[PDB]
Design an enzyme around this catalytic site. Structure first.
Site, PDB file in Angstrom:
ATOM      1  N   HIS A   1      62.008  40.510 -36.628  1.00  0.00           N
ATOM      2  CA  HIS A   1      62.607  39.135 -35.616  1.00  0.00           C
ATOM      3  C   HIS A   1      63.930  38.755 -35.425  1.00  0.00           C
ATOM      4  O   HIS A   1      64.306  37.728 -35.026  1.00  0.00           O
ATOM      5  CB  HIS A   1      61.538  38.107 -35.356  1.00  0.00           C
ATOM      6  CG  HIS A   1      60.618  37.819 -35.362  1.00  0.00           C
ATOM      7  ND1 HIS A   1      59.551  38.123 -34.362  1.00  0.00           N
ATOM      8  CD2 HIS A   1      59.482  38.868 -36.119  1.00  0.00           C
ATOM      9  CE1 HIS A   1      57.612  38.552 -34.544  1.00  0.00           C
ATOM     10  NE2 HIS A   1      58.497  38.611 -35.619  1.00  0.00           N
TER      11      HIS A   1
ATOM     12  N   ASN B   1      52.324  35.486 -32.503  1.00  0.00           N
ATOM     13  CA  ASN B   1      52.800  36.233 -31.627  1.00  0.00           C
ATOM     14  C   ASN B   1      52.787  36.110 -30.031  1.00  0.00           C
ATOM     15  O   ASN B   1      51.558  35.327 -29.943  1.00  0.00           O
ATOM     16  CB  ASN B   1      53.237  37.734 -32.666  1.00  0.00           C
ATOM     17  CG  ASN B   1      53.900  38.107 -33.734  1.00  0.00           C
ATOM     18  OD1 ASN B   1      55.177  37.517 -33.406  1.00  0.00           O
ATOM     19  ND2 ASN B   1      53.627  39.536 -34.182  1.00  0.00           N
TER      20      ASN B   1
HETATM   21  C1  HDD Z   1      54.814  39.105 -46.141  1.00  0.00           C
HETATM   22  C2  HDD Z   1      55.238  39.362 -45.183  1.00  0.00           C
HETATM   23  C3  HDD Z   1      55.421  39.367 -43.778  1.00  0.00           C
HETATM   24  C4  HDD Z   1      54.231  40.039 -42.977  1.00  0.00           C
HETATM   25  C5  HDD Z   1      53.195  39.827 -43.608  1.00  0.00           C
HETATM   26  C6  HDD Z   1      54.980  39.204 -41.662  1.00  0.00           C
HETATM   27  N1  HDD Z   1      55.576  38.597 -42.109  1.00  0.00           N
HETATM   28 FE1  HDD Z   1      56.694  37.201 -39.987  1.00  0.00          FE
HETATM   29  N2  HDD Z   1      58.133  37.316 -40.808  1.00  0.00           N
HETATM   30  C7  HDD Z   1      58.270  37.346 -42.220  1.00  0.00           C
HETATM   31  C8  HDD Z   1      57.653  38.071 -42.957  1.00  0.00           C
HETATM   32  C9  HDD Z   1      56.120  38.288 -42.653  1.00  0.00           C
HETATM   33  C10 HDD Z   1      59.929  37.259 -42.408  1.00  0.00           C
HETATM   34  C11 HDD Z   1      60.503  38.138 -42.951  1.00  0.00           C
HETATM   35  O1  HDD Z   1      60.157  35.751 -43.726  1.00  0.00           O
HETATM   36  C12 HDD Z   1      60.340  36.820 -41.977  1.00  0.00           C
HETATM   37  C13 HDD Z   1      62.061  37.231 -41.169  1.00  0.00           C
HETATM   38  C14 HDD Z   1      63.114  36.331 -40.881  1.00  0.00           C
HETATM   39  C15 HDD Z   1      62.205  35.433 -41.862  1.00  0.00           C
HETATM   40  O2  HDD Z   1      62.669  33.966 -41.788  1.00  0.00           O
HETATM   41  O3  HDD Z   1      61.068  35.282 -41.454  1.00  0.00           O
HETATM   42  C16 HDD Z   1      58.866  36.666 -40.252  1.00  0.00           C
HETATM   43  C17 HDD Z   1      59.696  36.765 -38.850  1.00  0.00           C
HETATM   44  C18 HDD Z   1      58.837  35.977 -37.836  1.00  0.00           C
HETATM   45  C19 HDD Z   1      59.008  35.558 -37.197  1.00  0.00           C
HETATM   46  C20 HDD Z   1      59.805  34.409 -36.224  1.00  0.00           C
HETATM   47  C21 HDD Z   1      60.131  33.504 -36.770  1.00  0.00           C
HETATM   48  C22 HDD Z   1      61.712  33.107 -36.460  1.00  0.00           C
HETATM   49  O4  HDD Z   1      61.766  33.150 -34.873  1.00  0.00           O
HETATM   50  O5  HDD Z   1      63.369  32.516 -37.181  1.00  0.00           O
HETATM   51  C23 HDD Z   1      57.704  35.377 -36.199  1.00  0.00           C
HETATM   52  C24 HDD Z   1      57.359  35.004 -34.706  1.00  0.00           C
HETATM   53  C25 HDD Z   1      57.177  35.964 -37.151  1.00  0.00           C
HETATM   54  N3  HDD Z   1      57.314  36.625 -38.218  1.00  0.00           N
HETATM   55  C26 HDD Z   1      55.579  36.224 -36.574  1.00  0.00           C
HETATM   56  C27 HDD Z   1      54.560  36.694 -37.596  1.00  0.00           C
HETATM   57  C28 HDD Z   1      52.798  36.988 -37.200  1.00  0.00           C
HETATM   58  C29 HDD Z   1      52.726  36.851 -36.476  1.00  0.00           C
HETATM   59  C30 HDD Z   1      52.307  38.061 -37.939  1.00  0.00           C
HETATM   60  C31 HDD Z   1      50.986  38.326 -38.089  1.00  0.00           C
HETATM   61  C32 HDD Z   1      49.783  37.313 -38.801  1.00  0.00           C
HETATM   62  C33 HDD Z   1      53.804  37.466 -38.759  1.00  0.00           C
HETATM   63  N4  HDD Z   1      54.293  37.193 -38.930  1.00  0.00           N
HETATM   64  C34 HDD Z   1      53.057  38.631 -40.800  1.00  0.00           C
END
Ligand code: HDD
Ligand code: HDD
Ligand code: HDD
Lengths: 726, 726, 308, 83
Positions: free
Chosen positions: C101, C174
């Site tokens: 993202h 999402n």
């Molecule tokens: C175990 C790892 C992992 C898993 C399984 C998921 N995510 Fe995630 N997501 C992250 C690890 C992550 C992260 C790596 O922690 C991020 C990237 C950088 C951050 O700050 O958070 C992120 C970012 C992130 C953002 C951006 C937030 C922003 O605008 O700063 C959104 C909207 C989502 N995720 C939504 C989801 C949804 C709807 C998932 C499934 C239900 C999902 N993520 C699964």
């Protein structure tokens, strides 16, 4: 060429006793001491001799004495890229120190098991008596910064990195069998309480301040390890003369899937030996690097520190047969109830090359286990598993810390992780994901099995609601402190009382002292009354009527908990100060040095100046240090040979040298007219136990002296020291 | 085993044309292409086949599909160290991108000089025609992020890392011979103005917004490079078809100490060629990775990009001979006044294995020079020397960035620098300081000399007061924009006019457009009027009487400044789309492919779907992409063979394919009934120049087409495209 | 004075339709639009008009056009601390982008419930229809970098930070109601598969390459979200015209300790509307900032995105 | 840059000036100041070039270096007077 023509700038590359040669990096002092990990580091070692001085980009530097300027008295020019690189690297030399155990000293070695343990564990490094596993061990304090002193009163860390053929195993323990707290959630609380206080960052390396004893007075679970820290356990003579423990109950898993509860022990070959407090405190000032030096120098001498690995083994069905909870890290397992069974031996036989690159950057973590081992629900271990991976992200700069040379495994490692700061490995795998077809799914998973199999957790049963709740089986705080107390010798008990008294006297808020005295009254009223007396406190009649805690499964003492109750001393690697005069009697010195060499005991020849003196038969004697330069704190015993005793008879430093050693309970030997020094220590003409004396050093003189040294200290002298002004 | 049995997952380890095989890491695609730097990287290359999936600590993983939980429908447990290590590394994969030039593509290669240059420089890598110097070259844009598109209107960077026997030399240049600004103090101001605007972070990869043209309107020194950016120079066809320039004047230093002023040039063996704007902008959407892809695939096919290094050489006594200041980086040196002299050639012949490890982590810095080279007082260069060292501390995580493997020298490097985050090298030197006696002062300084000597700066005379002040000699802004403009062909001039016109139309504040038009009127009134007419602006009478700037030392034009004035087209490496039908005339296709292969021109067979079609003679033709899947944007010409033309005559995608290529001036060839397509592009029955047509592809057909291709585009068609709806 | 005399450099501080005025920072464009979070930020907001140009240490700069040199054609001097501060800060401007993202666009707003949800949850921001909660919302793609294009074919993120009186609540969702994979252990495998391929770092902002569909063919659990990705759901007309979903089942806890299973939804006031593929792909070239632009300008027009 | 985590170390409260500070620097790790300036560059017309340079003068004026004379060759050399 700036070296001296006689080549005296370079130490000899062979074992030499402490002080005979300048210390050196390990690959230069002992190039033929090798193991599989040391050899694997050769690709990153950098020489120096016969090479040109360059920049980090390989450009040869012509003038390393001057900045580039506009005229020899003008401004420095921004285009000096050689200056700016050299200063930039300097400007960014430091990395964050460890949150705890920031002060530590490390060495290379190897481990080897006595016999195959394949009946109880499938762990490969314990499967065959001929399998040699390289190790890297770091010893540490807990509270002080990396720049603090060695001989403080503290718990010591004992961390061993095993470079196994089936993964890195880190055994991350301390020198006491229990910890202060029960649940990892309290760790920042306890650590903040013991660390320097947050308004003014005082005091360094000491628990003797208000916030530590405040936390202790409100958290009686701390009392057991506090007992250990207040004993002479908290001030080891060296890292070679302390025990080690993993503290937590872990699991062993065999090829048939059987789990056996296990607790880990290191047993020092050199025996258990500790300082006394006045000596330890003064030594933090006369030599704050004493333990670091002693470790390095023992290895350069060939006095390789050795430790026997042992296991307390408990069958799964015996989980609840003890009064204490096996999963409670404030509780010990008495060796009287569960003996320690010998497993193998570890030898530390080479120093590092560069302290920063190998010691400071090393990363130990108790979550680093191998197949054949497993965790338990110990709520302190459980939270440790999160911390040791997390903290490395800032301390070591990111997630590729396993690529720093000292941390690399010696076995193969392959996976689908990519990128991150300072990524060294260049992956050629077409795939960075699995399942994948484009690389036929390699690298592949490996099913669990009796050897070389994949790791799979023991399928232990879980049942309960989601709760933030302490197990009631943990809520007993005074039996194990008592067991410890009753297991000590009378002189060890004295030192425990004096530790509590000295520390509480530096607590400013008196109500804190009184609350800690009340907790002691729940352990043992003899201990509590003795401490209260030194603090000017009087126990209430109600406090005198506190019913003591129960025994521990019938035990009323366990002599394995005492440093000295059972003799285990060893003179190999100890040091004696020999106090010289300008016309020493050589017959005494020859007898002294011959006896000491036979037992592997070192000597420092001390005088009032440096240089040399000449004995009666013309022999030239080089002086190692002055009386003030190497105080009695740094030696285990003092010998004064005969000769021109009037040379030093009225020397204040020479007299005080004997008074300090006397107060600190060390053996003292006086030859011939050196017996005149008995007056400075108030020893009557009849002599006393602990002062060897004779017409000369021949005969039984040195056997008496070495027998005293094998007993470490002269405990019977303690009633006599309080009148000595030293 | 998940890979298919026919083994079609693995690309052939042989040169193959683009699209023929899956692309692959360099060491798997071309394992036999080697140089010293490539070989020296084998110690950190990691394989995969026949290895177990492990943690970073070497423990084999049994189940890489599931977290550890209490029950198979229960909560995840903190003790899952395999999960947390995998997620931790993923969580920390990203490092800061480059402040500028964050979008780039890189390759390995080698450089070799034509003859010894020791008469003019003692630089070792120019000393011997048989001395081969490994290189690593990164091409880049400037404004956009690492995730931005390739074929934007921007300046291109052209950075070459020479792994020299006497140190790393980075030639860090751009594809135009000047920069936008004069003094490095303005660099943040200029970059902030061209980058996305700070309130909303718009627009990516475009100078077409208010703050860029605001800065330009107020900073006439920018006008020269702005002219290059608005020309077709700002949208090159490939990194292979652009020039390269060091921009600044440097110094060559020979063994007798004579300094010669030098500017560096790269001349592309493939000649100079650019896209047109509508094509380039649409391509940032159809394939934002077009330049990166084309570079990679040319190397896999054996079409190695080649560039000739050349020097403009100016004796020290000629420093003030020209109208422009040699040290002014907004002024170019016309080849008509000082020719470019050939020096050697650079071949780029292998792709990296891991983009992140090799490309993203590469660190170029123009302060990395070697003995035989030196700087000048160019005030833009002077400030660059500070920045490229400083920025790596955050981008690459500390001062040990030279230890990251792609950045390592291949020659020795030894000094007294120690520690720092991620420290890899383990120093055995007893000394970390000089002068020192304890290691006989090694590593040692080296006096300068003819070869293998230390670096010493040229002792240039410096005289003046400490001032923050622009040299008056720099205060000329319009002569060199005019030289460039007048040196362009009429169709190049038209594209410049439309560059300015399109960009200024995107400026919201009308007064900014008006101020930029007033600046152009100080350059050329034909240019100024053409732009103004497209903006609805009317030049005043005073603007019409602005005196044009003087010639450059009597020079009014220089054809070396045009992309196309002197033909230099080369067809090897170019691509042709072939529009299939469901019953192709196999005799046509046979002759088309034989002629294209004879000149190294690639082909892609397109259709309305994927799979295969069969020709009239039963031959099965494999489809490379669909009409929409690989638009005409991505090819250099189009050929439509004869066959069942009715199969595609009414297919909108097929008709548009030709209309797009026609609009963008590309050659089109039509055989047999394919000539029916002349209607969609409004070509009359008697044909026109740039449209090849015949009864069959036999005969001079393919020669006519390849002749058009060597000329790149059909410039004569420009008047006809404005009526074409595409 | 470099501004035009007619003041046409400055946008009006009132709602205006897209393209009518230059865009501007929110507190300059709409200073009367306030909430408690926006107001709490005034302590760190920095002005500019009628202030002197300084170093970070507060020293006024006399000449911001030149480096200090020994003569005006001379070498630059190391003692020019004004240069080195300015270039140092420039040299360190960038921070790592989000792992996923990375490309995203955000705005401020507020939330309030229709009625008290006390019967089903004791969450404070849902307890009172008169209780205003400030929010900060970031919309995003998933695969592409911070510099990639908006109208790609991808899932979209829809993250909402509620600044409630009892703590920050982040609803990180999402625009489709499910995700690709079942167990978080597989997330680096899936993400590595969809991201640019490791040898050459191609393609940007696209799942149309071998490794993504390799993973999909081998992991049928992915197929449901793939079906949403391949539909017009994957190319929304605007952030204002897509749904939002928390995806996971969470719990609501009331004051009696009764748990209720809940899944979260965001319903767009502007309705559901998507592009078509050829349109979306060409638009990543003609305007890679289309969605960021459209959100910013809708808000400047007073045409506020709303979601139930 | 390493010791305090980046180039905004002047925003750590103990290090903050008590007098006004305004310039066109932006971003960097842990940026606290939220800049409302339309422009992050100078010269600019869109904020009428604020914040602006200040000529040197007797009080409240801009910093200018003392124009000491410099005369010599570029050398890595200790002055003999230091010997
Ligand atoms: C175990 C790892 C992992 C898993 C399984 C998921 N995510 Fe995630 N997501 C992250 C690890 C992550 C992260 C790596 O922690 C991020 C990237 C950088 C951050 O700050 O958070 C992120 C970012 C992130 C953002 C951006 C937030 C922003 O605008 O700063 C959104 C909207 C989502 N995720 C939504 C989801 C949804 C709807 C998932 C499934 C239900 C999902 N993520 C699964
Ligand atoms: C949840 C937090 C936590 C808890 C409850 C513990 N520790 Fe710890 N320990 C850490 C968190 C930590 C750490 C903060 O993660 C350290 C600091 C630096 C590091 O790498 O790990 C560390 C360092 C550290 C070291 C030094 C390793 C080295 O030489 O680098 C030793 C020997 C121990 N610990 C031993 C223990 C023992 C015997 C414990 C009780 C049974 C214990 N720790 C509880
Ligand atoms: C004083 C600041 C400054 C100035 C005046 C310039 N640059 Fe620069 N340049 C940098 C500061 C910088 C930098 C910020 O240090 C970069 C960004 C990240 C890096 O490693 O270096 C960089 C990157 C960079 C790269 C990319 C290298 C790579 O692929 O990693 C190239 C090709 C150039 N520059 C070329 C130039 C040219 C041809 C300039 C005008 C003659 C120029 N730069 C002026």
């Amino acid at each position: 060429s700036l070296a001296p023509e006689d080549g005296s700038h370079r130490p000899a590359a062979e074992p030499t006793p402490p002080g005979a040669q300048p210390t050196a990096p390990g690959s230069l002092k002992a190039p033929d001491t090798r193991n599989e990990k040391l050899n694997s580091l050769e690709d990153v070692r950098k020489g120096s001799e016969n090479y040109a001085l360059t920049t980090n980009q390989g450009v040869r530097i012509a003038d390393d004495q001057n900045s580039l300027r506009a005229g020899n008295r003008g401004p420095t020019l921004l285009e000096d890229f050689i200056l700016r690189e050299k200063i930039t690297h300097f400007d960014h030399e430091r990395i964050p120190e460890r949150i705890v155990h920031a002060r530590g000293s490390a060495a290379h070695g190897y481990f080897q098991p006595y016999k195959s343990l394949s009946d109880i564990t499938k762990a490969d490094f314990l499967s065959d008596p001929n399998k040699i596993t390289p190790v890297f061990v770091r010893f540490s304090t807990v509270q002080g910064g990396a720049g603090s002193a060695d001989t403080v009163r503290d718990i010591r860390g004992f961390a061993t990195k095993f470079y196994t053929e089936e993964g890195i195993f880190d055994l991350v323990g301390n020198n006491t069998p229990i910890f202060f707290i029960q649940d990892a959630h309290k760790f920042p609380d306890f650590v903040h309480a013991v660390k320097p206080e947050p308004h003014w960052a005082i005091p360094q390396g000491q628990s003797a301040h208000d916030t530590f004893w405040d936390y202790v007075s409100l958290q009686p679970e701390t009392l057991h390890n506090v007992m250990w820290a207040m004993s002479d356990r908290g001030i080891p003579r060296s890292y070679r003369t302390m025990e080690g423990f993993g503290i937590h109950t872990f699991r062993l898993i065999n090829a048939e899937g059987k789990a056996t509860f296990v607790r880990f022990h290191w047993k020092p070959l050199a025996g258990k030996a500790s300082l006394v407090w006045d000596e330890a405190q003064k030594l933090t000032g006369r030599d704050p690097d004493f333990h670091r030096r002693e470790l390095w120098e023992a290895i350069e001498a060939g006095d390789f520190p050795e430790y026997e690995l042992g296991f307390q083994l408990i069958p799964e069905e015996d989980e609840f047969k003890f009064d204490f909870d096996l999963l409670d890290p404030t509780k010990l397992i008495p060796e009287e109830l569960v003996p320690v069974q010998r497993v193998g031996k570890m030898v530390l036989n080479r120093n590092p090359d560069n302290f920063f690159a190998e010691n400071e950057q090393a990363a130990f973590h108790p979550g680093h286990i191998v197949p054949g081992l497993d965790f338990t629900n110990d709520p302190l271990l459980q939270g440790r598993l999160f911390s040791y991976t997390d903290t490395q992200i800032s301390r070591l700069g990111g997630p590729n810390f396993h690529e720093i040379p000292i941390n690399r495994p010696t076995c193969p490692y392959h996976n689908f992780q990519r990128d991150g700061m300072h990524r060294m490995g260049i992956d050629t795998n077409p795939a960075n994901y699995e399942p994948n077809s484009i690389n036929d799914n390699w690298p592949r998973e490996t099913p669990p099995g009796p050897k070389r199999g994949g790791f799979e957790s023991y399928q232990e049963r879980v049942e309960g609601n989601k709760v933030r709740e302490r197990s009631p089986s943990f809520g007993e705080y005074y039996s194990h402190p008592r067991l410890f107390w009753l297991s000590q010798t009378p002189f060890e008990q004295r030192h425990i009382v004096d530790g509590f008294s000295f520390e509480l006297s530096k607590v400013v808020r008196p109500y804190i002292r009184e609350r800690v005295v009340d907790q002691l009254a729940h352990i043992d009223l003899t201990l509590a009354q003795a401490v209260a007396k030194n603090l000017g406190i009087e126990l209430t009649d109600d406090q005198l009527n506190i019913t003591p805690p129960p025994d521990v499964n019938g035990l009323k003492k366990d002599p394995s908990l005492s440093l000295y109750a059972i003799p285990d001393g060893d003179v190999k690697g100890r040091v004696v100060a020999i106090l010289l005069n300008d016309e020493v009697r050589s017959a005494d010195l020859l007898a002294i040095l011959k006896a000491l060499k036979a037992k592997g005991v070192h000597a420092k020849l001390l005088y009032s100046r440096m240089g040399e003196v000449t004995a009666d038969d013309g022999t030239v004697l080089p002086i190692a240090a002055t009386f003030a330069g190497a105080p009695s704190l740094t030696v285990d015993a003092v010998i004064v040979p005969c000769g021109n005793i009037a040379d030093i008879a009225d020397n204040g430093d020479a007299n005080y040298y004997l008074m300090e050693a006397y107060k600190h309970l060390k053996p003292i030997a006086l030859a011939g007219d050196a017996r005149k020094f008995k007056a400075t220590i108030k020893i009557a003409d009849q002599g006393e136990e602990g002062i060897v004396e004779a017409d000369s050093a021949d005969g039984s003189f040195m056997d008496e002296l070495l027998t005293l040294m094998a007993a470490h200290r002269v405990w019977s002298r303690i009633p006599k020291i309080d009148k000595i002004p030293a």
